[model samples]
Target: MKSLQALFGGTFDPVHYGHLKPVETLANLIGLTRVTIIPNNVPPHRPQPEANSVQRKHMLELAIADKPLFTLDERELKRNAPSYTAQTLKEWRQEQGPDVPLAFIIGQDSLLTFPTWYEYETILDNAHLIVCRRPGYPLEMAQPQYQQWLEDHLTHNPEDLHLQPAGKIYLAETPWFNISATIIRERLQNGESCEDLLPEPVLTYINQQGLYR
Candidate 1:
């Protein structure tokens, strides 16, 4: 039968409280069974990320150590090339008997770029899109560029956006802080202290390992 339920995919290089905060809020807002954190081996768009897949995965393990509802998924981290959400969803769909509910958690910024994802149609077909609306980032479907892109890439049928079975998109607004991994890394490398930026364990893990040191 269907096994896994929900999946949250990201690189999570030295995951901090800003990243963990959303998932916890998401669980409370939406009754989630479990969140499988998947670290992508290679992010296609990001030219050069800070850490490798394995290091990112290890960091994730440390980040979610206290949350019982969180679990780390290794499939995407093992992939050889760039990872796509559609491919990951396809694999999970087949493994879960095709009818099990699958939810993909993503940020509003990433959601804005959904039209460009590989086989995005299929990804929508098999999963519910859970978008986290961070502060300063809004999900306005009426944006001209996104609307135009949708018109070109997606089915032109008028009813597709409104009536498709898997097009059920949810918008979740949480503590939208602007803490970025890039910023944290830069500060740490510069010998700056992020006393108020990260969680205790995460700050300790980063410093203990001499990460970004």
Candidate 2:
């Protein structure tokens, strides 16, 4: 059997302490063989990313260099288009073979909106989802009717309902820092010190590149 693995995709614009903490938390909790940190080139539904893929990838490299198991997956960067997880997962499943069990690392807020995502059903079918809940975020299904609604529209058939268990949603009780790229960007733009928020190397790279300033 293939090892259970996770892919943590993000913009990682000038990667900071906030970003590294969660990866470390999940790495221990899940026993991930490797965590593929995918930096987005352009995200379709989301606004154009603040940093280019090259700059974001560079920050990721500097941030995770000392961690043996943490590495970059530049497929999305190479694609140079809006990177959607569904498309990425679909291609990965084909290339890694069907036996390779894949999981996606996502924030609880994002997971809550899974039904609204492009190819949402395909993502759940192809990969187990590990959602990291932020402090005070509710995890319960939105409506009591959602289960029946899922069975109605999204499910292919009765068997599709059955395969669901093989990759159900899983939540982790990781703490939230309330730190975001927007906040970091604002601080950088305002010439505020971010010494506490970013790893030294990452901070150094951001400063040297004059990122976000």
Candidate 3:
């Protein structure tokens, strides 16, 4: 019953342990068979990534190759603009076919605005939603309407996600890794060691590519 494959997309300017550790915890808890790490080519409206597309992906490739459970996906990097969650899954389902039991990973903060995404319902229609909880921002803080939206699909059993293709929401009680690509880049530029924040291979690749400096 563990055919569930989870997907995560981010601008891992230089992929770090923060991204890795939390997902590792959630993957094991929910019994995800595989987790795909996709690099977003351009994140809309946010501060631009310190590293360019290729550099970021190269670093991601280095990190995931060492982590056996994680796989690096380049689908979103091929896009000219930000990839839409609905569009990405639509394409994925076409190839994967129905009944593969796909899932998409998100943070508790992202779930706060989950309903605002373009065609968010279609995302749930395409795959199970995994919301990883962290410290500080609790789920109750979400505005009333979104709370209702979550309640509609919330499920207690992690195994429920494997029963079908999509439409279940699982709130994972995962730990906060207390870091981001922004913090890592700032430290690298300031000549501080993000050695503690990043995986060694990713850190080494960042230095070799002269990123965030």
Candidate 4:
């Protein structure tokens, strides 16, 4: 049987530990073998990366170099178009077929704004959603009706997500590490070395390339 395959997409400007740790923890909770990480070229909702696509990819490569659970998937960057998760999940469905379990990872902040996403309603048809809620966000922001629809697909058991290929909602309890690529960039620009926030090789690569400034 295929274990759950989680899809994680991000700008990953330098691929910090903040991005890795929470996802790894959630994957362990859900019985996942590995996560498919997509680095976007043109993220639809966020600003473009300070590092170029090649540089970003290289940083991710160095960051995940020692870890087997994180595997980089680069179709979004190669497509040379605006990267959107909905259509990407559809492509994932087509390529992986109907039976293999696929879970798309997103944060609670994203969950609140999910209704505004392009073609958002069609996403669950292609894969299950693993919503990771951190300590930094408010829970009462979502509407009751939307919450009802969310509740319609909610499953307390992680096994349900592992068993089904699509259409379930699982909230992953995750750790809040106060780190982000945005702040890291600003720090790098000011010559502050990020210790635990970045993987060693990623930090080295940034320093060697004189990036973020």
Candidate 5:
């Protein structure tokens, strides 16, 4: 199988280790050469990010500065609108070509409610879904709708994902880091040190900019 490329998108309000480590772990599991981290500008379903788009993007840059495999994709931030996963994946398909294997890293919890995302079916069509398995959210316990989708599209073989550009769900069994951006922000609000939860440069940037407080 050729080297796979994955896209992981989030608001990344402060870009903590919870967001960074999982992608790196999954990349290693799937033989991915690069993982693109897209920071959302305006999330359609979640609350507006505490840090503005520029600050959020900068935090991601700082976090991934030393990781060559991690690419900071500022497309969603550049668009400066409600970021849709399907739209971005379609654009990536056009740019990367159909032959290259493309996967979108998503949480198993998100997979349970996958249908709710904007043009979600189109997203499945454009990129293979790599579900990051979190503790307490096993695929076996997923809802009926999600189970049916898995029945139709899921694959246990990592090679299957690389053989095709899209239309497969590969479950990544990874270590669960219970870190959350919400909790991190709250800790910062309480003037607690996030030195352990975030990269040094990212924590420094957040402190210097007075973000997420």
Candidate 6:
């Protein structure tokens, strides 16, 4: 049987523990053998990052240096175009074939804005969606269309996501961690310490490169 793999993608401007821990938690929850973190070169939904693509990639590398289960997938950065989730998932489907299970991880807050993503239906067709809900963002707050979509595809068992290649949505509950890359960047710009928020190596790399200032 092919193993289950999860993909998490974002700008990852500095690669903090806030981003890393939940991925690890989800991987454990879903019994995923491998968790890939994709660093985007050009994120369409947000402002351009303070750190360049290369710097962000390096920071992620340093952050996950000791994590054997984590793999940094740089296809988005290599594409040199707008990083669209649907397109990326389609590519993964082609590369991994129909047998291997693929799960795309996203936060519940993303569910509220899910319909705005480019070709989102195609994303659901390509990979199972593992929506991790942290405290304060209720899934019920999603728009009517999204609520219907969730109801149509919702699965109570995480294994349903691992059993098939795509078309299932699993909800995961995660602890609230009040951390955001924006706040971290602001702290860095204000000459404040972000030692607790980020991995030591990533912090050192950010400081050495004079990033986010």
Looking at model 1, which ten-residue stretch has the lowest summed lDDT? 156-165
Each candidate: what lDDT?
0.70, 0.71, 0.81, 0.82, 0.82, 0.82
Tens digits of per-residue lDDT, candidate 2, 22-97, equal: 7677656656667788777655655776777788898889989998778788898888656688889888788787
Q: In candidate 4, which residue pairs clash?
A: none
Better of 2 and 4 by lDDT: 4
lDDT for each residue of candidate 3 in 43-140, tens digit (9 for 90 to 100): 66767777888888888888878677888878888877668888888887887889688888988888887877647789888988988886777666
Model 1: per-residue Cα lDDT over 141-160, one tens digit each: 43556665444433323223
Show how many residue pairs clash in every candidate, following the order shown: 0, 0, 0, 0, 0, 0
Better of 2 and 6 by lDDT: 6
In candidate 6, stretches whose alpha carbon ends up further than 4 angstroms from where it belongs are 43-46
TM-score of 2: 0.84
Which model is ahead, 1 or 6, in terms of TM-score?
6
Error of 4 at 153 (Å): 1.8
Global Cα lDDT for candidate 5? 0.82
The sequence of per-residue lDDT tens digits that candidate 6 reaches over residues 1-213 is: 388888899888778877888777765676777988887875556578889989999999998889987999888888866668888888998999989888888888876678776476898788888887778666663566567876788888987877788888888865546788989999999998898898999998887888887
Q: Per-residue error at 79 for model 1, in Å?
A: 1.7
lDDT of 4 by residue, 1-213 (tens): 467789998888878988888887875676678788988886557567789999999999998888888898888889966668887998998998888899888888888767777465688888888888778676443566576667677788889887888999888887757898888988888888687798888998888998887
Candidate that beats the other on lDDT, 3 or 6, i.e. the better one: 6
State in Å the error of residue 53, model 2.
Answer: 1.4
* Worst window of 10 by summed lDDT in candidate 6: 137-146
Clashing pairs in 3: none
Q: Lowest lDDT 10-mer window, candidate 5?
A: 138-147
Candidate 3 local Cα displacement, residue 87, angstroms: 0.7
Among residues 3 or more apart in sequence or in different chains, the pairs in candidate 2 whose N, CA or C atoms overlap within 3 Å are none
Instruction: Write one digit per residue (lDDT tens) for candidate 5, span 114-174.
Output: 8766476788788899988888876653456556766788898998887888899888886
